[PDB]
Amino acid sequence: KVIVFISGSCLFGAISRSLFKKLPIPYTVVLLILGAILGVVASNVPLVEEHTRDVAHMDPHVLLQIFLPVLIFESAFAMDVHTFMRSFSQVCILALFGLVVASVLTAVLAMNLFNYNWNFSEAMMFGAIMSATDPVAVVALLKDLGASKQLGTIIEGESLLNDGCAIVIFNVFMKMVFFPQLTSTVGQNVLYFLQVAVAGPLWGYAVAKVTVFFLSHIFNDALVEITITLAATYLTYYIGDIWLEVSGVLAVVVLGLIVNAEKTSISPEVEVFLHRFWEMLAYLANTLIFMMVGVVVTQKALVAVDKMDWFYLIILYLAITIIRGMVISLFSPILSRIGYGLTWRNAVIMTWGGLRGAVGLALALVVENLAGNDVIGSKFLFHTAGIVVLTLVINATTIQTLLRILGMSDISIPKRLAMAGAVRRIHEGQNRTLNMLKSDRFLADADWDIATAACEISDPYSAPSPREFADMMEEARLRMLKAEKISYWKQFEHGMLAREALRLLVQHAEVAADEKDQFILVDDLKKSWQIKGIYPWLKRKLEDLISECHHMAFEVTINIAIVLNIVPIIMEFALRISNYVFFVIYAIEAIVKILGLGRHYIVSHWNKFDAFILVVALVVVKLFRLLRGLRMLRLTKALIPKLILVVNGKINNQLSLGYDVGKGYIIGEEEVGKIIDRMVDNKKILRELKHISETGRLQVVKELGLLQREHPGIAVSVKTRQAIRTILNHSRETIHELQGAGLLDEMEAHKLELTVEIKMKRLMNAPSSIPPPPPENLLKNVSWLAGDMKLIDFIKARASLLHFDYGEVIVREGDESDGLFLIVSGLVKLYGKVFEDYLTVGNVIGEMGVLTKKPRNATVTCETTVQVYFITAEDMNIAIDTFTLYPSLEYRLWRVVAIRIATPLIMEQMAFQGWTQEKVKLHLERGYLVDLAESHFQFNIDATLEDVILINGTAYNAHTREEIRSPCLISRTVHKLTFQYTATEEPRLFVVRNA
């Protein structure tokens, strides 16, 4: 009865999809044609009719209740939400208003043109049933070509809103026409429509938040998440369908959008499996419904064949294209007025794009089957089948021509040269590997002609004067922006940036590239991270100011007692026992209030509210029983902490992105100067570019520091989160290196990987994002301070705390080095001889003045009320004299300042090409310095060391008698290093032994 048709439909869909991949037309039109010829055969041969009747004439209710929600949820689950939510207002207003105007114009045109005796409800049904779309076919081509991501996102996100609101309009009008017994009074109808509008999406959002909350607490598991997510989706659909007739699909689409939004709380394997499963289900539904529409349109087309009917179909297709063009043109200036308008080229390609799909045919078969023995269903089905096959041929065939006529199909010259370079490098490497393989013992037998023929990759992208000064400046600007984009991509690949920050940086860089003589401004980035101050911040401040046997479990039990007491009154809003347990609960709350009175009753407002509620409880009968429930309001004093935590989480989510953007920009600017130092020629050009980059760096650093200063309760959390993520990433890299080296077996490596993944997932939702730091922990947390509690106590006894107001000056250039400084709260500016910098909490000032005892070379200007920790120089000297263990503290000072003074030198020499700041820092950290006292102030360079750098002292080469000042790198030319008894300038070296 059923099995033959479904198996044949799956086979035919498989064949057509696998065979029309290269062809331009989509695979669906040939599916429709196969369904048509199957319908002809079933009309002729009775056995095919017997095997077709049970599924072609399907009960329309199961169609409208099963096939539609799967398709809508798939189209919801398909995309990303960030691009959608970033441009939600545009697509929402466009979809809604275009849909309603298309429906009404198509309806009135049907009245004016068809010469049928159709009432208004049928005409609105017609307009709403040919307004559904399916941009899948095109959006795939647009994403493949990659002309514009915003256009593809807009044309693909129009689909959901269009289909959902078309379904809703169809549902209300179908209930109006085919079920006449339903009352069409104004008040009930508007109440029902408002219910559809609000009760659907809110219910979907509620269940989405509930299931995300349950899902975030499941660790190292996969089978639980899949079943609970599928159950959540199905129960949302079932509840939505039980309460309302049509709001279920809206609840499902909003649930899908939200559960796709919170991607970080689901393991990647679970989400990729879920995407694949929903996609397979949708594809099966699509194939089966197209078979069904083909057979049912063939079996019922001989009763409505008419030449003027074909003329009506043709002019209807022309009319609907015209109407879509007209509404897009009408809304183009209004959409341009919002600051996020679209080009006319985008408008025309998007109105010619977009075409009918499976949704229209689903609703059409619903109409046809509900119509029964009438011509109205045949007219509906014939018209919609004609328009869908017509657009599936015409638009999906000529869309490539429309792309090629306009400038969208063109490929940028930089992308072409990138392709040429990449393919040349790939070809050269493959040729080199082939030459190497031809020299081996084992593989010389293989015939290399077929071998080389088999392996080949082609090109997918091809088959003095002031005017001279301006041209050189433009060339430098272009290469500047290219190098900055390269650094951004490299740093994203290594993994210190989130995807959103990289997308923002790339968009800003390409916008600056498109604009003439415009660099990357900071004002746009300032607006990017300056979303901190919004009405949520005012709400947080208000909530902070409203809030202020003593175990926490006491009030926890009070809250759960209130929760259980909710049930009897909410059932009332058995009587004798209910009153008795009410009396028992009243007595329990009375003794709880007595205990609270024993705790000095210091509560301000909740005490008054509890007193009022107790007065009500201890004290027209129906009204009193209805209004004796204000005790429900007592839970809000426990609901406030949850709200302040969630608003803190929100502000954390914003601040993390804003912080990452600044960090990526500052790293890129730091590296690109050393990039351009190897390239630039004109002195004025390099001076101007360096000045501009330094100005941007200073502005960004100062603004970010002030933003951190504004409220540290979130900056502390986000910085700790980033630090722990970095540590776990490097531990995972070390684990994989050990696995590749073979020293760790595969099972143990998998166990270690599992532990690391568990730690990272615990990180993903562990902190409350509000850790307050104390200053003494900051003093004891310094790198060289750590490792000796005795030295920590000595410093803490000998440290001093100073406080300064805005605009003051702490130390000036050339003054005597009174001691080492340690900033513990605030922000400060450091200006000294040309260069300028900004220092924040967690740094120290002036290690030269306490190690080399040289005069200061900077000036310190306070920017806010700063708290600083101060150690006198003589105390540092006596601490150096006291502690002389193997990890000597002064050795730690020299190591730290050596790293800080050697990283810029290495990056200037650019010795480690393709290395970020982190890798160079780690490589220099692996090294250690060795004392020259035990080696007679002579050092021999061996092959074990990789890089050597001298920090202080005068380097005397044993051979050739070369005198080298400090600090600078020494190459492999020097073989022996010699020093004498130079107490005035103590020599200091640094070596990096390789393995």
- The answer to whether the annotation marks 849 as part of a ligand binding site is yes
Interaction of residue 723 with a copy of itself, rule CB under 8 A: yes
User: Contacting a copy of itself (CB under 8 A), which of 227, 264, 465, 984?
Assistant: 227
Q: Which of 202, 470, 922, 968 binds a copy of itself (CB under 8 A)?
A: 922
Cβ distance to ligand POV smaller for residue 178 or 831: 178
CA distance 351 to 102: 13
Cβ burial of 663 (10 Å; 0-12, 13-18, 19+) is: middle
662 is in an annotated binding site: no
Nearer Cβ to ligand POV, position 3 or 983? 3
Q: Which amino acid is at 926?
A: R
Q: Is 847 annotated as a binding residue?
A: yes
Q: Is 242 in the site for ligand POV (CB under 6 A)?
A: no
Q: Which is nearer to ligand POV, 214 or 519 (CB)?
A: 214
Q: Does 230 contact ligand POV by CB under 6 A?
A: yes
Nearest to 367 by CA among 196, 183, 184, 175: 175
451 binds, among ligand POV, a copy of itself, none (CB under 5 to 8 A by kind): a copy of itself
Q: Which of 738, 873, 905, 929 binds a copy of itself (CB under 8 A)?
A: 738
Residue 24's φ and ψ, nearest 5 degrees, are -75, -35
Interactions with ligand POV, residue window 185-214 (CB under 6 A):
none
Residue of 129, 161, 752, 868 that binds a copy of itself (CB under 8 A): 752
Amino acid at 8: G
d(CA 354, CA 592): 66
3-state secondary structure of 493: helix
Q: Binding of a copy of itself at residue 222 (CB under 8 A)?
A: yes
Q: Which of residues 16-75 bind a copy of itself (CB under 8 A)?
A: 17-18, 21
Which runs of consecutive H residues, i.e. helices, occur in 244-374? 247-261, 268-299, 307-336, 344-352, 358-371
Cβ 894 to a copy of itself, closest distance in Å?
A: 14
DSSP β-bridge partners for residue 949: 969, 990
CA atoms within 13 A on the CB side of 535: 0
How near is the Cβ of 809 to a copy of itself at its closest, in Å? 22
User: 386-405 burial by CB neighbour count: b if 16+ within 10 A, else e?
Assistant: bbbbbbbeebbeebeeebee
List the interface residues with a copy of itself, window 142-181 (CB under 8 A): 146
Query: Furthest-apart CA pair in the chain: how many Å?
Result: 113
3-state secondary structure of 969: strand
CB neighbours (10 Å) of residue 873?
Answer: 16
CB of 949 within 8 A of CB of 902? yes
857 belongs to an annotated ligand binding site = yes
Positive or negative torsion for Cα 290, 291, 297, 300: negative
The correct pick among 88, 193, 234, 583 for binding ligand POV (CB under 6 A) is 234
Choice from 2, 62, 186, 450 touching a copy of itself (CB under 8 A): 450
Burial of 500 (0-12, 13-18, 19+ CB in 10 A): middle
Tell me which of 213, 448, 580, 835 binds a copy of itself, using CB under 8 A: 448
Q: Which of 92, 93, 104, 218 forms a contact with a copy of itself (CB under 8 A)?
A: 218
Cα(709)–Cα(713) distance, integer angstroms: 10
Residue from 112, 777, 980, 984 binding a copy of itself (CB under 8 A) = 777
Name the CA radius of gyration of the chain, rounded.
Answer: 37
Phi, psi of 146 (to 5 degrees): 65, 40
Residues of this chain, 60-99, that bind ligand POV according to CB under 6 A: 61-62, 65
Alpha-carbon span 547 to 640, nearest angstrom:
8
Looking at the Cβ atoms of 226 and 873, the one nearer to ligand POV is: 226
Min dist CB 495 to a copy of itself, Å, is 11
Distance CA 777, CA 865 (A): 20
Q: Give the DSSP per-residue string, 357-421.
A: -HHHHHHHHHHHHHH-SSHHHHHHHHHHHHHHHHHHHHHHHHHHHHHHHSGGG---HHHHHHHHH
**Of 378-417, which residues contact a copy of itself (CB under 8 A)?**
415
Report how many residues bind a copy of itself under the rule CB under 8 A: 133
Judged by CB under 6 A, the residue of 59, 144, 447, 514 near ligand POV is 59
Q: Which of residues 628-667 bind a copy of itself (CB under 8 A)?
A: 663
Q: Which does 691 bind (CB under 5 to 8 A by kind): ligand POV, a copy of itself, none?
A: none
Quick one: which segment of 55-63, 389-397, 464-472, 714-722 binds ligand POV (CB under 6 A)? 55-63
Of the candidate residues 24, 120, 315, 421, the single one contacting a copy of itself (CB under 8 A): 421
What is the spatial distance between Cα 101 and Cα 323, in angstroms, rounded to a whole number? 9
Q: Does 489 bind a copy of itself (CB under 8 A)?
A: yes
Binding partner selected for residue 65 from ligand POV, a copy of itself, none, CB under the kind-specific 5 to 8 Å limit: ligand POV
Task: Give the contacts of 861 (CB within 8 A, at least 6 positions apart).
Answer: 807, 808, 809, 810, 828, 829, 830, 831
Place of tokens 């500052």: 666
Q: Which C-beta is closer to ligand POV: that of 28 or that of 233?
A: 233
- Residues 283 and 233 sit within 8 Å (Cβ to Cβ): no
Q: How far is CA 146 from the centre of its chain?
A: 20
Instruction: Check: CB of residue 224 under 8 Å from CB of residue 218.
Output: yes
Measured from the CB of residue 137, what is the shortest distance to a copy of itself in angstroms?
Answer: 15
**Binding flag, residue 586, ligand POV (CB under 6 A):** no
Q: Which does 61 bind (CB under 5 to 8 A by kind): a copy of itself, ligand POV, none?
A: ligand POV
- Stretch touching ligand POV by CB under 6 A, among 59-67, 244-252, 676-684, 926-934: 59-67
Q: Is 846 annotated as a binding residue?
A: yes
Peptide bond into 967 cis (omega under 30): yes
Given ligand POV, a copy of itself, none, residue 963, with its beta carbon under 5 to 8 Å by kind, binds none
**What is the nearest approach in angstroms of a copy of itself to the Cβ of residue 178?**
28
By the 8 A CB rule, do 36 and 298 touch?
yes
Regarding 748 and contact with a copy of itself (CB under 8 A), the answer is yes
Tell whether residue 224 is a contact of a copy of itself (CB under 8 A). Answer: yes
- Residue closer to a copy of itself by CB (options 451, 587) is 451
User: Pattern 877-896, binding to a copy of itself, x per CB under 8 A?
Assistant: -------------------x
* Count of chain residues binding ligand POV (CB under 6 A): 7
> Cα separations (Å) of 468 from 475, 679, 682?
10, 17, 12
- Of 185, 972, 981, 984, the residue at the interface with a copy of itself (CB under 8 A) is 972
Minimum distance between the CB of residue 69 and ligand POV, rounded to whole angstroms?
9
Span of 33-41, 270-278, 384-392, 876-884 interacting with a copy of itself by CB under 8 A = 270-278
Cα separations (Å) of 208 from 117, 204, 637, 840? 46, 6, 25, 41
Minimal CB distance residue for ligand POV: 62
Q: Say whether 79 counts as a known binding-site residue.
A: no
- Interacting residues of 581 by C-beta distance below 8 A, sequence separation 6+: 568
Out of ligand POV, a copy of itself, none, what residue 881 binds, judged by CB under 5 to 8 A for its kind, is none
Taking the complex as a whole, the smallest distance from the CB of residue 21 to a copy of itself amounts, in Å, to 8
Distances, alpha carbon 346 to alpha carbons 28, 147, 328, 342, 352, in Å:
26, 10, 10, 6, 10
Q: Which does 59 bind (CB under 5 to 8 A by kind): ligand POV, a copy of itself, none?
A: ligand POV
Q: Which of 93, 616, 899, 964 binds a copy of itself (CB under 8 A)?
A: 899
Positions touching ligand POV (CB under 6 A) are: 59, 61-62, 65, 230, 233-234
Q: Which positions make up the binding site for 3',5'-cyclic GMP? A: 846-848, 856-857
Q: Which positions make up the binding site for 3',5'-cyclic AMP? A: 846, 848-849, 856-857
